[PDB]
mmCIF file of C-alpha atoms and ligand atoms in Angstrom:
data_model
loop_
_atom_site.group_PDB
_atom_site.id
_atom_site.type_symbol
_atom_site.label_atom_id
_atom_site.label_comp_id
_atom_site.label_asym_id
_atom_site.label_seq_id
_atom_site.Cartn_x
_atom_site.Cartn_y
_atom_site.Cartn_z
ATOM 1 C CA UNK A 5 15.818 53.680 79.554
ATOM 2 C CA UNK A 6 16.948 50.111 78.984
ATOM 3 C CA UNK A 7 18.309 48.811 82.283
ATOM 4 C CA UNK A 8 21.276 47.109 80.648
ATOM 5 C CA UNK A 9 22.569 49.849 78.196
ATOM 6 C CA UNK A 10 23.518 51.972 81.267
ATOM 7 C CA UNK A 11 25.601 48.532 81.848
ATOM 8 C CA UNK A 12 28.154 48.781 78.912
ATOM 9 C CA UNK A 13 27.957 52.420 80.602
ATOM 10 C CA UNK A 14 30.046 51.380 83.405
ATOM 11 C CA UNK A 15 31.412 47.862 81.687
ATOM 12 C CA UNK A 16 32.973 49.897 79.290
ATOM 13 C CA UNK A 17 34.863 52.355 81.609
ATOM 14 C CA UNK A 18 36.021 49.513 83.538
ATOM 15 C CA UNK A 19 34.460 50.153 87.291
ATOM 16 C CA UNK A 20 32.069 48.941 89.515
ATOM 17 C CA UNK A 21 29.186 51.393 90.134
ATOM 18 C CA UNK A 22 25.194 52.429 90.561
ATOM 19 C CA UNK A 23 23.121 54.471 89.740
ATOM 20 C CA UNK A 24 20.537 55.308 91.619
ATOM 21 C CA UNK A 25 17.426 57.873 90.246
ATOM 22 C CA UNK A 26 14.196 58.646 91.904
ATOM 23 C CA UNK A 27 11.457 60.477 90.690
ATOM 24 C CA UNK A 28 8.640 61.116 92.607
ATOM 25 C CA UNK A 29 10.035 58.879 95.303
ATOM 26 C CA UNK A 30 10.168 56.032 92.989
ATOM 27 C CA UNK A 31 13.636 54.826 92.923
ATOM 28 C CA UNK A 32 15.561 52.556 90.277
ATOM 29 C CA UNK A 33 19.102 50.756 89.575
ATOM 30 C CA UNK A 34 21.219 51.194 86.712
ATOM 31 C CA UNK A 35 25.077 50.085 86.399
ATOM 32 C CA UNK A 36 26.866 47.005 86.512
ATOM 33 C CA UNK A 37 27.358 46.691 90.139
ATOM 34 C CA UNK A 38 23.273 47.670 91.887
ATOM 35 C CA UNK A 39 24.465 45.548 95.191
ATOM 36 C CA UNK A 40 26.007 48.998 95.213
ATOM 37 C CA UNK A 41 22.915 50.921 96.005
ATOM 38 C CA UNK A 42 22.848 49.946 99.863
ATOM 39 C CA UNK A 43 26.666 49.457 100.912
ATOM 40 C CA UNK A 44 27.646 52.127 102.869
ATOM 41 C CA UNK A 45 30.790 54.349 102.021
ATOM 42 C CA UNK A 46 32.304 57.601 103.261
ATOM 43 C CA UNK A 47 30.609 60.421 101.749
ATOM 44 C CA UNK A 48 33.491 62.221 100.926
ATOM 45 C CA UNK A 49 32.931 65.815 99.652
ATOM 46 C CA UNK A 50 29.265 64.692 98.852
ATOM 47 C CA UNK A 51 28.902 65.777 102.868
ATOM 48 C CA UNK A 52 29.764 69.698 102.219
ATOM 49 C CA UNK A 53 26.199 69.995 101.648
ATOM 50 C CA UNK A 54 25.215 68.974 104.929
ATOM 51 C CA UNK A 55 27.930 70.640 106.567
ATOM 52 C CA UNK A 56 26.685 73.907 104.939
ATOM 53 C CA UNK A 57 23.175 73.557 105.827
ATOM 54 C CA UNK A 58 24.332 73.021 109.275
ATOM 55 C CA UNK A 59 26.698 76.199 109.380
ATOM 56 C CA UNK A 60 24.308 78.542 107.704
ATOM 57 C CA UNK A 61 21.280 77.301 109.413
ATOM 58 C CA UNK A 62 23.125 77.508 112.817
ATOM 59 C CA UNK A 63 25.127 80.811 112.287
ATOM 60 C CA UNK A 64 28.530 79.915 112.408
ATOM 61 C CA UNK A 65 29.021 81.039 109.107
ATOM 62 C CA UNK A 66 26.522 82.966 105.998
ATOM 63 C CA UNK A 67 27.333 83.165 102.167
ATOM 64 C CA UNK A 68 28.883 86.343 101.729
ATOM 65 C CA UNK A 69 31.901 85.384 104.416
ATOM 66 C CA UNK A 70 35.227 85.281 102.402
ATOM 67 C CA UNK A 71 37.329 82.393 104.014
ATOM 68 C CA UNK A 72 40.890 83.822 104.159
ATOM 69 C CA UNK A 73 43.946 81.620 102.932
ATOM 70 C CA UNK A 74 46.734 81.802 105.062
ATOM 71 C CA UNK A 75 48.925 80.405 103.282
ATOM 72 C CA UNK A 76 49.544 76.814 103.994
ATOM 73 C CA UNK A 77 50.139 75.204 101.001
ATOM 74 C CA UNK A 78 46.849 73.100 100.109
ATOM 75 C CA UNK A 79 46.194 69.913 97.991
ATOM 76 C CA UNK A 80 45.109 71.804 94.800
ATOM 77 C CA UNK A 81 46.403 75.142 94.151
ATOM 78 C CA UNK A 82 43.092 76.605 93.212
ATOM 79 C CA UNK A 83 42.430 76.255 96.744
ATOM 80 C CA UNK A 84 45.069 78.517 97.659
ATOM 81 C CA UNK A 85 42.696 81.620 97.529
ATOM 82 C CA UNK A 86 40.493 83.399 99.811
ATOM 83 C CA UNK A 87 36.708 82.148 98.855
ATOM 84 C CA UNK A 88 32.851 82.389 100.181
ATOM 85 C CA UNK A 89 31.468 78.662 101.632
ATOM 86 C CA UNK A 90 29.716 78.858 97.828
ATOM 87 C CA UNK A 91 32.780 78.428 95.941
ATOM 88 C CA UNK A 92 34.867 76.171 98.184
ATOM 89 C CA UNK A 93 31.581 74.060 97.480
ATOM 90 C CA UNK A 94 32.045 74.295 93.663
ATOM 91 C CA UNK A 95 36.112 73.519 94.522
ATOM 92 C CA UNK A 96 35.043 70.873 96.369
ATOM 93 C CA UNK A 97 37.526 73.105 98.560
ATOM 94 C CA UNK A 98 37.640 70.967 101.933
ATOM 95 C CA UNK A 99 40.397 73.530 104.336
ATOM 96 C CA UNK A 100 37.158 75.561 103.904
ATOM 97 C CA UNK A 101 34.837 72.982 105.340
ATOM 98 C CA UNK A 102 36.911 71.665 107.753
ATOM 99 C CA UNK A 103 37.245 75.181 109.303
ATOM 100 C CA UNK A 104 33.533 75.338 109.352
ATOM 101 C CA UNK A 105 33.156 72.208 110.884
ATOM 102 C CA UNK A 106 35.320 73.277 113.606
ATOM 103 C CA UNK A 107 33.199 76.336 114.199
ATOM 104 C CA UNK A 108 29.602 73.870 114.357
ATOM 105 C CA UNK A 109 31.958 71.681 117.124
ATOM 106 C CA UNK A 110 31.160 67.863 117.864
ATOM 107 C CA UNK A 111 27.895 68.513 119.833
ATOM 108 C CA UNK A 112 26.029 70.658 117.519
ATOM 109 C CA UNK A 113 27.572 68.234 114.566
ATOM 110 C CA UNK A 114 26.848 65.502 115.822
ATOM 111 C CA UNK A 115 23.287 66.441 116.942
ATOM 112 C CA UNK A 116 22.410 67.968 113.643
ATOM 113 C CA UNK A 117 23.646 64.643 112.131
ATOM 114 C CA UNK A 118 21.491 63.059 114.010
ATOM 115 C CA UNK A 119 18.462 64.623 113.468
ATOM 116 C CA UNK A 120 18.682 64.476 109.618
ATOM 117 C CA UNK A 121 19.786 60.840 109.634
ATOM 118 C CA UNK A 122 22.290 60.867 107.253
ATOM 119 C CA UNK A 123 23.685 57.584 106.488
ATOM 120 C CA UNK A 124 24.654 55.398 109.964
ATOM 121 C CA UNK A 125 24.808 59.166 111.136
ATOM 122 C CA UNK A 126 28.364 58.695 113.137
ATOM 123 C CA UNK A 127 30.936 61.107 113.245
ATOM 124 C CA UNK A 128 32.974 60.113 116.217
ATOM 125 C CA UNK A 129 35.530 62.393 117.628
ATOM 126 C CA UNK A 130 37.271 64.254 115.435
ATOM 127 C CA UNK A 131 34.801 67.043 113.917
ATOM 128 C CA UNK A 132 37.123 67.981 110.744
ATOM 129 C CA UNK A 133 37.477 64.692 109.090
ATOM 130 C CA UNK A 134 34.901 62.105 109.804
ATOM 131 C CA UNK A 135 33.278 62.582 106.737
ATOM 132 C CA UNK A 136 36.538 61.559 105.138
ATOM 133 C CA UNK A 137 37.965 58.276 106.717
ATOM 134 C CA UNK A 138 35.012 57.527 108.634
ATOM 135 C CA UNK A 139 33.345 56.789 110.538
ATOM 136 C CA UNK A 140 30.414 58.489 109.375
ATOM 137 C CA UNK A 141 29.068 56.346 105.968
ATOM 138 C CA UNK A 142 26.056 56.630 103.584
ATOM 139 C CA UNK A 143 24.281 54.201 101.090
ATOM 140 C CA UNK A 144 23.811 55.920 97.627
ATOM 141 C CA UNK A 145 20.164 55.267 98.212
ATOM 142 C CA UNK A 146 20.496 57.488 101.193
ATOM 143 C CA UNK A 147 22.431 60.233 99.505
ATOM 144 C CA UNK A 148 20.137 59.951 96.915
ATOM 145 C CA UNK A 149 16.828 60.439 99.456
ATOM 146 C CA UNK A 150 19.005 63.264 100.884
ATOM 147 C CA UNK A 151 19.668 65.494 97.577
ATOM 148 C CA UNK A 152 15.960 64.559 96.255
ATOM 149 C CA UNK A 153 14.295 66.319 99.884
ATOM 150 C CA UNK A 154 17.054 69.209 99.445
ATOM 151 C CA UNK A 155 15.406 69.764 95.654
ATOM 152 C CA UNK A 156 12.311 70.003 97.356
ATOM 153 C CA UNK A 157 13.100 72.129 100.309
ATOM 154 C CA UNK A 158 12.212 68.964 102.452
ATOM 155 C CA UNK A 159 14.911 68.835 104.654
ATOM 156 C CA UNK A 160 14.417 69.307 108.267
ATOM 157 C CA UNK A 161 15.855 73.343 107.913
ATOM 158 C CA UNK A 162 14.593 76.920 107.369
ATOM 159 C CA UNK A 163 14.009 77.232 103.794
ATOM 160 C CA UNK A 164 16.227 80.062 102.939
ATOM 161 C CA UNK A 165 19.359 77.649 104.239
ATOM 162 C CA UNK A 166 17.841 75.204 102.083
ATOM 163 C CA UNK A 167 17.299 77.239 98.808
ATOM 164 C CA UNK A 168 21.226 79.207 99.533
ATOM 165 C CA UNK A 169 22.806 75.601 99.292
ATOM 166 C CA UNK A 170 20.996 74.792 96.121
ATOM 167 C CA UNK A 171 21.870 78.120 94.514
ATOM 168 C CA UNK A 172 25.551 76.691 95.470
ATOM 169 C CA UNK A 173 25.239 73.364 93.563
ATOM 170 C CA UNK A 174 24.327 74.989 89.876
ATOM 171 C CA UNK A 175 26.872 72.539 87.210
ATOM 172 C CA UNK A 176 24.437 72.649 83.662
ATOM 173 C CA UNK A 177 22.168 74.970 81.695
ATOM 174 C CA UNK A 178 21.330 72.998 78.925
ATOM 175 C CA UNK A 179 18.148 72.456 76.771
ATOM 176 C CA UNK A 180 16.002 74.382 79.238
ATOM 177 C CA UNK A 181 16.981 71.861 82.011
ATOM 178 C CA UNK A 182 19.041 72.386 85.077
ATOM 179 C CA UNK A 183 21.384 69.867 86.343
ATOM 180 C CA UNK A 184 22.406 70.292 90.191
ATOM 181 C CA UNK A 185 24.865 67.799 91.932
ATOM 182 C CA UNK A 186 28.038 67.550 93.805
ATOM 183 C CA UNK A 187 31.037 65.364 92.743
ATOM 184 C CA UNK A 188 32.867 63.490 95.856
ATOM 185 C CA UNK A 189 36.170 61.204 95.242
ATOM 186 C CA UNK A 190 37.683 59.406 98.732
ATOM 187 C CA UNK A 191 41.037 59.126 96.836
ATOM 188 C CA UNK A 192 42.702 57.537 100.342
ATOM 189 C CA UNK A 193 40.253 54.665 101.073
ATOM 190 C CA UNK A 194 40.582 51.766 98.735
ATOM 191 C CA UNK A 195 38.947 50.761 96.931
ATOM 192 C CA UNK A 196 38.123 54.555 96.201
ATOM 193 C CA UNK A 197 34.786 56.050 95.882
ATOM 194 C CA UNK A 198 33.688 58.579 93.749
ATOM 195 C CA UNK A 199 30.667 60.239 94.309
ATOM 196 C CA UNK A 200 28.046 62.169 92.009
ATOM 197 C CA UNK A 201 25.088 63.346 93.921
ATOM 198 C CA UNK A 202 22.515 65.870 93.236
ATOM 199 C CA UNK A 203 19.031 66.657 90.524
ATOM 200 C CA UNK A 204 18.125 67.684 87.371
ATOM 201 C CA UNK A 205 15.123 70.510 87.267
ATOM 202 C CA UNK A 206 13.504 69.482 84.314
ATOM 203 C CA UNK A 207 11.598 72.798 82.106
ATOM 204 C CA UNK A 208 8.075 71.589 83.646
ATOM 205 C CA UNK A 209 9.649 72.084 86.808
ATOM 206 C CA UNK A 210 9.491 68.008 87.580
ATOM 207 C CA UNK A 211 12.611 67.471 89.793
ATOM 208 C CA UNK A 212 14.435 63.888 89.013
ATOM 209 C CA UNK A 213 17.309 63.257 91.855
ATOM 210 C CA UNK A 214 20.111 61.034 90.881
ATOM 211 C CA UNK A 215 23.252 59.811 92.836
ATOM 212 C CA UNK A 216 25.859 58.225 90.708
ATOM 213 C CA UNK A 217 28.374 55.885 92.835
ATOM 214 C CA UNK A 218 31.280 54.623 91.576
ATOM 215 C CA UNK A 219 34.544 52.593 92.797
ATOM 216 C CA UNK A 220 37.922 55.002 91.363
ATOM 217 C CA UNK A 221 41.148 54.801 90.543
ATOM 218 C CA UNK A 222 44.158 57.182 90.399
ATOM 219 C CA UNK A 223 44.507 57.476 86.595
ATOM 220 C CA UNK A 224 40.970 58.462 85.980
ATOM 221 C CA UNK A 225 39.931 61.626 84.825
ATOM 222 C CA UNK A 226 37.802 64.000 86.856
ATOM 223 C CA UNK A 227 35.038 63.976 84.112
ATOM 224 C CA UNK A 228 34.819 60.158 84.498
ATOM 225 C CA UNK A 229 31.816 60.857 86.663
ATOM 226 C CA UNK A 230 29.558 63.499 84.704
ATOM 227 C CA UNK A 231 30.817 61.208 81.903
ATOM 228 C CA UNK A 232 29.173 58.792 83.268
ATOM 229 C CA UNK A 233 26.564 60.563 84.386
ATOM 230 C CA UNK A 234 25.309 62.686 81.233
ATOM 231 C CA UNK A 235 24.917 60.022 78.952
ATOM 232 C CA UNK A 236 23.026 57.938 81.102
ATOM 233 C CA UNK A 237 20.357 60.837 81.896
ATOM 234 C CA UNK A 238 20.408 61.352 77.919
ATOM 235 C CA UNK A 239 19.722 57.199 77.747
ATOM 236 C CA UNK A 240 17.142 56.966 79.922
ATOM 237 C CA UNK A 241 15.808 60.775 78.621
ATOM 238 C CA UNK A 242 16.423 62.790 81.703
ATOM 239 C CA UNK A 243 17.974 65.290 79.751
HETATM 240 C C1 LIG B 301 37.682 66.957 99.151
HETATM 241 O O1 LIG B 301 37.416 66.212 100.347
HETATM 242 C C2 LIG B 301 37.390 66.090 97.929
HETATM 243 C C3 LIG B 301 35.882 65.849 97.911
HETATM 244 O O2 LIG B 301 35.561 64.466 98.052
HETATM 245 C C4 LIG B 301 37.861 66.800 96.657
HETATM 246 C C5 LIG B 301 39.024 66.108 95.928
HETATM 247 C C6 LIG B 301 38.434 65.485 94.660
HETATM 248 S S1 LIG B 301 39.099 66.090 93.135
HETATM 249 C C7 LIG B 301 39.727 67.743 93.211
HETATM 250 C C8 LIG B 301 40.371 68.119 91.879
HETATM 251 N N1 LIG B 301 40.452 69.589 91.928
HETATM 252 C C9 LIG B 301 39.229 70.033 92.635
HETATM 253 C C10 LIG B 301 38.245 70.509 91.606
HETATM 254 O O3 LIG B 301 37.404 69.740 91.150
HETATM 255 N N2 LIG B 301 38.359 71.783 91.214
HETATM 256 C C11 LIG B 301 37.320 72.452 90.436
HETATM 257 C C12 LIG B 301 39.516 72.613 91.531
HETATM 258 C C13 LIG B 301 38.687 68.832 93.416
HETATM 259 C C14 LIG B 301 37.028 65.944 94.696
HETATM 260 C C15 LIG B 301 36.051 65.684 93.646
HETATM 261 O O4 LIG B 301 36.007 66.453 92.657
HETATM 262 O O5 LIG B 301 35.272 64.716 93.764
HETATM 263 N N3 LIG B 301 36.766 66.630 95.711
#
């Protein structure tokens, strides 16, 4: 894991991004742009995690709930289904979340916020969108703190909230390992963040929790950020 390979990782893609792993609470720096690592930016989707531990650990919602589309048209068109809080997180499906977040209310958000800490941990006034345009922000560090104690069941919730939001995040099977994350792209901020945040479950059972921050652009491809991602964790021997 050569802390400068990772770097004609993101030189040659042409971005400015970090990496940020931590294992065992140890954490490390790979990209081309580590000031990175403790900038703050809007989480994006990265915060549908949160917002689902909040909603299932609080009752406003549970994971067998179908979420009815009603027939607005939406930003992707695989969005424009009915769908359980588990896959409008694997859609990254944010009507979904927004309606959820309406249900919590500012209070209860903003309290719950609060008592995690996550990031400056301020959402303002409008409960369905500060997570998009501000003003709540987070460090990659941070995120990366955050996913690692939701690997462990850490976070300040019931477990079974805890261990129903991981069962959400599943994206690899591969070699006997696990890979969990959620992707996040701000595509209306600029510059525009993209966001990769979540853990590989290594066969041992060792958890490793990464989170993979990026500036974006328009052009780019979706896979830009597993991209990315993969053949770092291959470099360094994650996976
Ligand atoms: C929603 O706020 C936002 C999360 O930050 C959405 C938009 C982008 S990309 C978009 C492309 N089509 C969706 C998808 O991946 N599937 C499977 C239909 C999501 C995004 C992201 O992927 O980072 N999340």
């Amino acid at each position: 894991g050569h802390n400068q390979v990772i770097h004609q990782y993101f030189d040659e893609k042409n971005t400015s991004g970090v990496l940020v792993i931590q294992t065992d609470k140890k954490i490390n720096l790979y990209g081309n742009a580590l000031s990175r690592a403790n900038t703050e930016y809007v989480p994006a989707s990265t915060f549908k995690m949160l917002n689902a531990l909040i909603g299932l650990e609080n009752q406003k919602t549970d994971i067998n709930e179908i979420f009815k589309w009603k027939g607005e048209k939406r930003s992707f068109t695989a969005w424009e289904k009915d769908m359980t809080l588990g896959e409008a997180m694997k859609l990254s499906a944010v009507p979904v979340y927004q309606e959820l977040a309406r249900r919590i209310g500012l209070d209860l958000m903003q309290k719950e916020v609060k008592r995690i800490g996550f990031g400056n941990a301020e959402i303002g006034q409008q409960v369905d969108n500060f997570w998009l345009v501000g003003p709540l922000k987070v460090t990659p560090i941070q995120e990366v703190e955050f996913v690692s104690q939701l690997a462990h069941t850490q976070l300040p919730f019931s477990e079974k909230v805890q261990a129903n939001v991981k069962n959400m995040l599943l994206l690899e099977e591969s070699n006997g390992y696990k890979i969990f994350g959620k992707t996040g792209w701000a595509m209306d901020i600029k510059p525009q963040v993209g966001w990769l945040t979540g853990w590989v479950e290594q066969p041992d059972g060792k958890i490793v929790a990464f989170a993979l921050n990026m500036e974006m652009r328009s052009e780019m491809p979706a896979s830009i950020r597993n991209e990315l991602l993969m053949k770092s964790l291959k470099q360094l021997n994650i996976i």
